[PDB]
């Protein structure tokens, strides 16, 4: 019944005292934190508190949609000596600091990823040319499926691969995805290995990187330029914005203190110093 948009317990009035009751004194060893209300260390009046935590709720903290990655792709002239560029990004929030620190406050999470795409595009070369409104294909290639070889190959036939055909210049594309986790919460922090080493085997044959779980959890995104090699080479960028909608979090871990380094919690030297200076006796 106590929803997020209620109204903090109104401040009760309170006069002098001289009781053997000792609210003020704690003892942090117990790990428990004294739930002392303002009403204890001072005489308080009867304030009718209207303010509510309706905005700090776990749902609202992650109410904005963060940018998980950018993806460069380009359609060059047929006569191009180089193969046509089709970017392929492996679904995993861990690419940019922002959304990665928010999620990282919690040990485990169960959310419904609601991916949106703001696709842009300019003419590379100095050459003064034209290009009929391009259309892009954003194929979701599920963990284990065959990742696209050439730009135009069979893999793109997409008989069973959830794909979106975005026409340039239009309301930015959006596809909601339900908890696609193998477990019961995406583990923001995995302690342990994906293969245990066994004595009756070579040090290699059975090794593995710490913290890594599934080879392809979330999946991979194949994005091509669907049209054919056009005289005027046009490069494009597909910025994907992931916004965790129906979300839940567990175990409140302390926020990242020093600059992120790689997919693993590991940290580079130098960046190791986070705090700022201040005299132990200056306001």
């Amino acid at each position: 019944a106590a929803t997020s948009r209620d109204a903090l317990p109104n401040t009760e009035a309170s006069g002098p005292t001289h009781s053997k009751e000792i609210p003020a004194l704690t003892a942090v060893e117990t790990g428990a934190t004294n739930p002392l209300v303002p009403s204890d260390t001072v005489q308080t009046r009867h304030v009718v508190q209207h303010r509510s935590r309706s905005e700090s709720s776990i749902e609202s903290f992650f109410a904005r949609g963060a940018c998980v990655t950018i993806m460069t792709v380009d359609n060059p002239a047929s006569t191009t000596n180089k193969d046509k560029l089709f970017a392929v990004w492996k679904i995993t929030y861990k690419d940019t600091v922002q959304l990665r620190r928010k999620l990282e406050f919690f040990t485990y999470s169960r959310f419904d990823m609601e991916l949106t795409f703001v696709v842009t595009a300019n003419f590379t070369e100095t050459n003064n040319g034209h290009a009929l409104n391009q259309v892009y294909q954003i194929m979701y290639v599920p963990p284990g499926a065959p990742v696209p070889e050439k730009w135009d190959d069979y893999t793109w036939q997409t008989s069973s691969n959830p794909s979106i055909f975005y026409t340039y210049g239009t309301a930015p594309a959006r596809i909601s995805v339900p908890y696609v986790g193998i477990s019961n919460a995406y583990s923001h922090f995995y302690d342990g290995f994906s293969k245990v080493p066994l004595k009756d085997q070579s040090a290699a044959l059975g090794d593995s990187l710490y913290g890594a779980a599934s080879l392809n959890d979330f999946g991979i995104l194949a994005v091509r330029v669907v049209n054919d090699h056009n005289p005027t080479k046009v490069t494009s960028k597909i910025r994907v914005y992931l916004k965790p909608k129906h979300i839940r979090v567990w175990c409140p871990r302390p926020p990242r203190a020093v600059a992120y380094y790689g997919p693993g919690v590991d940290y580079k030297d130098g960046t190791l110093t986070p705090l700022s200076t201040k005299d132990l006796t200056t306001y």
């Binding site: 040990t107 485990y108 583990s187 922090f189 995995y190 302690d191 290995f193 245990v196 080493p197 090794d207 593995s208 990187l209 710490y210 913290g211 890594a212 175990c251 871990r253 380094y261 790689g262 997919p263 693993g264 919690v265 590991d266 940290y267 580079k268 030297d269």
Partner: peptide
């Protein structure tokens, strides 16, 4: 008592490469 306590290695080159025997 930290749940899922992933401590960080020590190689500024490659990340997570920490060995089991040692981990």
């Amino acid at each position: 008592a930290v749940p899922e306590m992933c401590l960080a290695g020590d190689s500024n080159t490659t990340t997570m490469h920490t060995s089991y025997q040692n981990a």
